[PDB]
DNA sequence: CTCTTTTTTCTCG
DNA sequence: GCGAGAAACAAAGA
């Protein structure tokens, strides 16, 4: 998932599990708990979920007075709320059981991670990760963004994916944002003029807030949290190879940029 | 059968 | 420090 999908999950969890006491925690894949599964089980069993937050693509469960469970879903992680008698599915790894149901984490590729840290360690954790600002008008300052782009000779798509200029874009929304901003993904950032940077900055905020409003991009639904999104119906370029650009009618092309599949319009995003 | 495809963080040179 | 490539892992498609 990217930031809009994780935000969608965050909102659903906030609505459904806040206030629930964790009765037990079980793992069939305990090695994805990077701070130690048995330690987590001992610390969190019997505690109550107080809140769910998000920073960039990270989910943050607020548990008990002092605990923060930092969850990254990476490429394929999925949460679902299930009955206590629900059958095991193949790639289920962890479950938090409550009195009336359970929260199951599944991840086919086993890339996702859990880390248990304390409340006063959350801000240092994300400083160490060097996560950039949230993609909001209030936090994403165009002036610093502009100065960083001016200084660099990185290509814009890989630099955006780093999470350091702004948090939250992954391959789908970086491709969408660069099409909306009319910028080619291989453009060296120190070649961007001020008006392009301004359109890029606003397009990042607008696309991600649109995607959040639509419940993220689900391809497809899965019975999991966040699986009823509608943003996939709004994609202009990602996965649209060979289809016609809605802006000019050129075929959308796919290339590889720094190892990643990259979808763009060659007319609207001049090299 | 092989090769390719689909977030973060490493090695290598 | 950089970029290129790939590991972590599983599955599906050519
Ligand atoms: Zn076009």
Author numbering: 1 to 271
From the article:
The Fpg/Nei superfamily (also called H2TH superfamily) includes bi-functional enzymes able to remove a wide variety of oxidized bases. The enzyme architecture consists in two globular domains connected by a flexible hinge: (i) a N-terminal domain rich in β-structures containing a highly conserved N-terminal α-helix (αA) displaying generally a proline (P1) at the N-terminal involved in catalysis and (ii) a C-terminal domain rich in α-structures containing both DNA binding domains of the enzyme (the H2TH motif and a β-hairpin domain structured in most cases as a Zinc finger). All these enzymes feature AP lyase activity consisting in the successive cleavage at the 3’ and then at the 5’ sides of the abasic (AP) site according to β,δ-elimination. In this work, we deciphered at the atomic level the structural and/or functional determinants required for the specific inhibition of ZnF Fpg/Nei DNA glycosylases by the uncompetitive inhibitor 2TX.
Four LlFpg variants were constructed: W179A, R247G, C248GH and C268H. The aim of constructing these point mutations was to (i) disrupt the 2TX binding site (W179A), (ii) increase the C268 thiolate reactivity (R247G) or (iii)inactivate the reactive sites C248 or C268 by replacing C to H (C248GH, which mimics the situation found in hNEIL2, Supplementary Figure S1c; C268H). The crystal structures of R247G and C248GH bound to 14-mer THF-DNA have been solved and indicate that these point mutations do not affect the overall structure of ZnF as compared to the wild-type enzyme. Residues W179 and R247 are clearly involved in the second shell of the Zn-coordination sphere of LlFpg by establishing NH—S hydrogen bonds (from residue backbone and/or basic side chain with Cysteine thiolates). To evaluate the 2TX sensitivity of R247G and C248GH, we used the PAR assay. 2TX is able to extract the zinc ion from ZnF of R247G 3-times faster than it does with the wild-type enzyme. Assuming that the PAR assay is another manner to estimate the inhibition efficiency of the enzyme, the variant R247G appears more sensitive than the wild-type enzyme. As expected by 3D structures, the suppression of NH—S bonds from the second coordination shell of ZnF increases the reactivity of ZnF thiolates in the variant R247G and probably also the accessibility to W179 for binding.
